[PDB]
Symmetry: D2
């Protein structure tokens, strides 16, 4: 079997859909091939909250942002290990990318709602209607059907076709036991995401990312795009830069949204009954601290007073039922009960909370310098939850320029090969700021399809 298009995009996430739509919009034949039976990848189960400095939503609310502030926030976030030109091009194209989603893809964002992720000087993350990436992916596939962009599911790319001159001329994929050849007259776009769900690749670049980390993403995020491109001598950088989330379900690895009480006074307790880290540190700092505790897990503990402010138990009854059923979460009346259900030394826990109560009563956390201020925990009932970290984002990946052209190890452009999204590795640095991944995949996805189409 043999297909021939101008642009062959691998991956039906946000990056691939943007590349595919821009290629078709330029008057070229394109196709998206998707390995999974469903479209969307991690972009589907994502919050799809998009950081934009100068958005129409900010103007509606009276918020004045700045592109240079957005740029410096992102660079300082990755400890200046990110590429300044890649960050600048992302920030400079964020407004146009968000307006493109609103006007071309018909994505509906909330007009009077934004979120401020950690490390952002100004609240700037747009929120899609429904607080889900499905709003974006549904509008993408609807738009793709209107413009005639075919999406081939259950089609796994396995080999890049390189001709005598070194130009990438197509993709060899597997569909229904059979070898499909995808001839790409103009370019191939690699939009395959990261490898957070590839434990053996994780260990290769960081032996500590073994079973003590879960994955917050889908099963398909296995880094196929990096292995494919490297076999034709593409460069990969920063493969060890990995973003984690510290409070995840030990069973599934998913982010434990019921433990968002951490932002309202919840404390992290280890098996000894002690606090060990500021609950509002960087996500990677908290995960590393959790892995230094006995057993490599932590407890999350709060009371009704905090729930009356956070409402995380009320807003996430599914997690409440699952965690309690699996024996990883209890609701108890007293701190003594909270200790015994998890065999925490009672006297050491009572003394720990007493210190928290004192820190709350004087405004200073003498133990870990809580930057918001601890909250009294004298009254119950209490919720106590057991959590472990999970790998969230692989900042490393393929080496590209600001035109998404893939470079080899000497830094030379590989003709016909483009990459955008989490599969690239030059934008974020050592820490991926919240809401920045979606700005990255839409901005560079659009560029990839525009560059591939010429």
């Amino acid at each position: 079997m043999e297909y021939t298009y101008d642009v062959v995009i691998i991956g039906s996430g946000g990056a691939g859909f943007s590349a595919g739509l821009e290629a078709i919009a330029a008057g070229r034949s394109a196709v998206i091939i998707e390995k999974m039976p469903i479209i969307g990848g991690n972009s589907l189960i994502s919050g799809a909250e998009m950081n934009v400095a100068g958005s129409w939503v900010q103007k509606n609310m009276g918020i004045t942002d700045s592109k240079e502030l957005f740029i410096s926030d992102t660079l300082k976030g990755g400890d200046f290990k990110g590429d300044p030109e890649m960050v600048k091009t992302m920030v400079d194209n964020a407004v146009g990318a968000a307006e493109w989603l609103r006007d071309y893809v018909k994505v509906e964002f909330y007009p009077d709602q934004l979120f401020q992720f950690g490390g952002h000087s100004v609240k700037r993350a747009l929120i899609p209607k429904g607080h889900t990436g499905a709003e974006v992916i549904s509008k993408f596939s609807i738009k793709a059907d209107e413009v005639g962009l075919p999406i081939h599911t259950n089609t796994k790319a396995e080999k890049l076709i390189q001709d005598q001159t070194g130009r990438i001329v197509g993709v060899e994929a597997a569909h229904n036991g059979k070898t499909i050849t995808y001839h790409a007259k103009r370019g191939v776009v690699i939009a395959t995401g990261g490898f957070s769900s590839n434990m053996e690749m994780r260990k290769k670049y960081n032996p500590e990312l073994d079973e003590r980390y879960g994955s917050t993403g889908h099963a398909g995020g296995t880094g196929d795009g990096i292995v494919m491109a490297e076999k034709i001598h593409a460069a990969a950088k920063n493969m060890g830069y990995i973003q984690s989330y510290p409070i995840c379900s030990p069973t599934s690895g998913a982010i434990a949204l019921i433990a968002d009480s951490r932002f309202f006074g919840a404390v992290l307790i280890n098996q000894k009954g002690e606090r060990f880290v500021e609950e509002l540190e960087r996500r990677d700092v908290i995960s590393h601290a959790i892995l230094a505790q006995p057993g490599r897990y932590t407890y999350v503990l709060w009371n009704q007073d905090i729930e009356n402010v956070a409402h995380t138990v009320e807003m996430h009854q599914g997690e409440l039922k699952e965690f309690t059923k699996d024996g990883l979460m209890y609701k108890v009346d007293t701190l003594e009960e909270a200790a015994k259900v998890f065999n925490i030394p009672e006297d050491k826990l009572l003394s720990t909370i007493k210190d928290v109560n004192h820190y709350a009563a004087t405004g200073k956390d003498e133990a870990f310098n809580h930057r918001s201020g601890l909250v009294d925990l004298s009254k119950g009932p209490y919720w106590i939850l057991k959590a472990t970290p999970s790998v969230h984002h692989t900042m490393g990946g393929l080496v590209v320029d600001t035109r998404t052209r893939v470079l080899d190890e000497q830094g030379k452009v590989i003709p016909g090969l483009f990459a955008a999204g989490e599969v690239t590795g030059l934008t974020h640095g050592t820490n991926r700021l919240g809401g920045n991944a979606y700005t990255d995949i839409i901005v560079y996805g659009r560029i990839a399809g525009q560059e591939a189409a010429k």
Copy 2:
């Protein structure tokens, strides 16, 4: 009609009940005479939250307070216009007074709950069961009945009886049109409270305390004790030092508890549609600012987001129904609606909230330096409330020493005359810190009855 006791106490508030119980406990005949048909005065409708440094409740929760911190908090609160010896004696006797209420009067405080009023470095205010002064007054009258302390209601003291030597030998009161003579063999205790409900006396020492201020207290607080004592040449000081609460009902003058959203993001708006004061300033600073606005009133405005955190609308449905019925509070869907219901200039209000939204999105209130941080007000619905200040506490009053003995204008002790509670004027200074009035009346009430009984 003629009565003869050892100690005659005027006033059945917290100060009088403490004096009466201590006098009877010393083996002397005593009586409390009360002008109103009910007992309790302002102590009854009070929150009865009592500031104590070193209380058993603090120890239960692990909080470590300090008496010197409590002393310096109180002195700095009244801008060091209070008497240092009066503050020291109050703080040094706070633990014994609170334990006396718990052990002798059988007052029930919460074991795991405290409140931190403004200006207190450590959370230290005890809370009675039920969050009401009725818990204290009910236990007082029960204890008074057990120990044989008669309380004569509908008996208004009108003249102090002074003998040839200048000693105060009794009280002349009015009961049922008739003149009752109360012979006091050992002492008279003046425990009549303040004059927050005496508008003409308020204007005498501050012409600005006219109809633009309400009263948060009961009708009986009219300063009878100061006029009585001054006619036998007792000294009064600081009569102009008055404590106000800025957000009160324009109809009743009571504290508007539904407007506690001020501590969660609610903004104060004047008739022009502008903010004019930091919403977390001192209570006297906010009241003075409110009286500088057009009409001498202010608006309080918040939204569902704040109610989801403050719950003040849910916890005070009575105020919601009354304020809305009286046309002083509206729930609306949009800010445009919030402007029109009170004829606030719409464009100026929309621009004001836009600035608040920007201040919330950047953490800095460039207009009034909100010390907690403003909260976004882009989404509705909204509550908007009209409020005016009310006189809350008259810090001035009779001149006493730390033994509650009343002094004349040369500072000499008037024999047989004692005073305790809000009727005295040397403890608090220019600003009465929250929870400090109850520590004052119990500590010095007990001293008055002990000194009067000898």
Copy 3:
């Protein structure tokens, strides 16, 4: 003897010179009569630092101020007891007043230097060349000589001349034992300053302003203008609102500039060897706290480390020589020496500094919440200084409107009578912010002369 002018100005300070120059500029005869043998009054010995929002100096440095911020800073500073219309007119005319001094009077301000007084959200106080009011007064008298504005020194106004209709028609003054009559065809301007140097008038409106307060001003500031105007039934308000400076020479009453180490780590110690107030509180709060300590004085203590940062000893050798000669300041090698020279209990002082050293080593002042952070005092040598407060500014005075017209007790305009400067009492409220007095006297001085000339 008899003189006849259009406008007769009483007082050769900043307010009078502005009124006199504006009257002459309008084509009218004017005269300034001065009681002292020298011109300038308190405006001469002043720092002459002038608060201006939107000044050319701010623009030179890149600082963006706001008039509404300036207005709200001033109003919140006087606890909203100031007149909002008087503050608004002062702030709105501050730029024009400062430009008038620079362009008409030829006052030289520094182009790249400003000062930020307490309570100002933005650094906005202009600084005259030489850091002295003599720069302003010298340029005033030079300009007055050029425009023909006669100044009569040794001429004390003692009575306002009021005609049959109630119009103020002139001034009766005393010069060389003889009664001079000053006929004022258009108006009289009262520009006599405050009464900080009138102890008996101070006690009249505040019995606490006796010998325990000095005066930072000149001997002529005795409130003659208020007594004069009140005898023709002018209104005076807020006479008890007084501004103090806490750290002054006990001998002279002048501000102790060598004790500006307070802004760099110096601590205030009482006779018991203890701290008693946050060293960075409001000036009135510190003065009141000083008067609550044993003896009604305080000690100021710092070391070479602070001098290496503050340089106050180096920059004020005159005060160093005078205070040391008078036995009110010592330089010692050890804290033990610092205790014995003033008979401070040594053990209590050593423990106090140990607490300061701990507070400095942890960043939190647990005793008084030092808002800048204490500085270690382990090493010497040390300077220790004895200081007492002094009355600095009398915010009260004559009642005027925003056109400087004097009002009677019913609030009615007294024809021909105007007042400007510290002699008026409606601008500042309960606390006069630094740099605001000079904006007040120039803005309203100019208005007085313009209104008097018509």
Copy 4:
């Protein structure tokens, strides 16, 4: 040539001298072999400031520290990548190590002086007399001569002698072209320091540590100990964790102490005339930001106002003369001059400083959130300096247990082989806190000699 001792220590730094003295103190023959012609290594040119929680100096000053705070400060500093047992053993033995230096080695620390490095909650770093490591090394060699500990300079260890059973039985060294055999009957101690001066080894574990980084250390710090131990199959970990200092001389690589004005208001400017990083960020964050600027260097700029507070120009005249002579530092009168001497775009620099002046005048750095507050730079003269980062500390190295026993790659103890100091790699993590390296080398140096001697 052949020598036989019980313990053979390689390296005459702080770690080796501690091991050697403890071995001799246990009654065993020992020797220190030193590759350089001088003793001391990096410990000699070090500040020798030693972090100790609970030191006698803290007690002298009244400072109360905590070992658990010290532990959590160190762990959070290295982002919890350090070994918790290695940090705990260091902190728990810090007091005994410092007292050992004071009492046994006779090191003189200041009794009333400490320093607080970044990331330490309490000021805790002891300071040796003279502010130099030479105070420690001089006392070490004096003590070594008294106890008979021979030190062989110009003797470079090149091969570890391993016997048939795998036990490390001695050292083969080179002295004067000849092969010296050092038989170690009990143990060998590797105390060779780090590899900050080994550029090719630096690039091996981090290709970015090339010529754009200097070295702040001596020429001998070339990682010989790691290569030696790895050839007998010892494990090395974290070799990429490197500590940098951002402001160093481009010529020598030494830390530019004259640029300590950064802690007083100095700003970092790139070639474009812009700020690019908060001047008070982490040292690694600033270095990475400097390498992202045009040319991979930065400028440091301050004025006389800051020098009047920092005194860094006055205290470091040698650097002033050298940097100016080499054309890497200028003193100029105006900002225009400061731009032209380094060909910085003048208009962009003037606008940058104007923003700083505004940020200083309002207290908020809107561009990079300066945590101390910027300082006005309107007036000159100015100093402007060109600086580049240098590698300061190699946190990685040999794998040991808390008894300094070297482990192989399966984690098994290699008999007779011990290591202590910067040559080990498990203590500090990703960021070496200031003053922590000296606590590490003394505590584990002592342990090494005690363990080697048995």
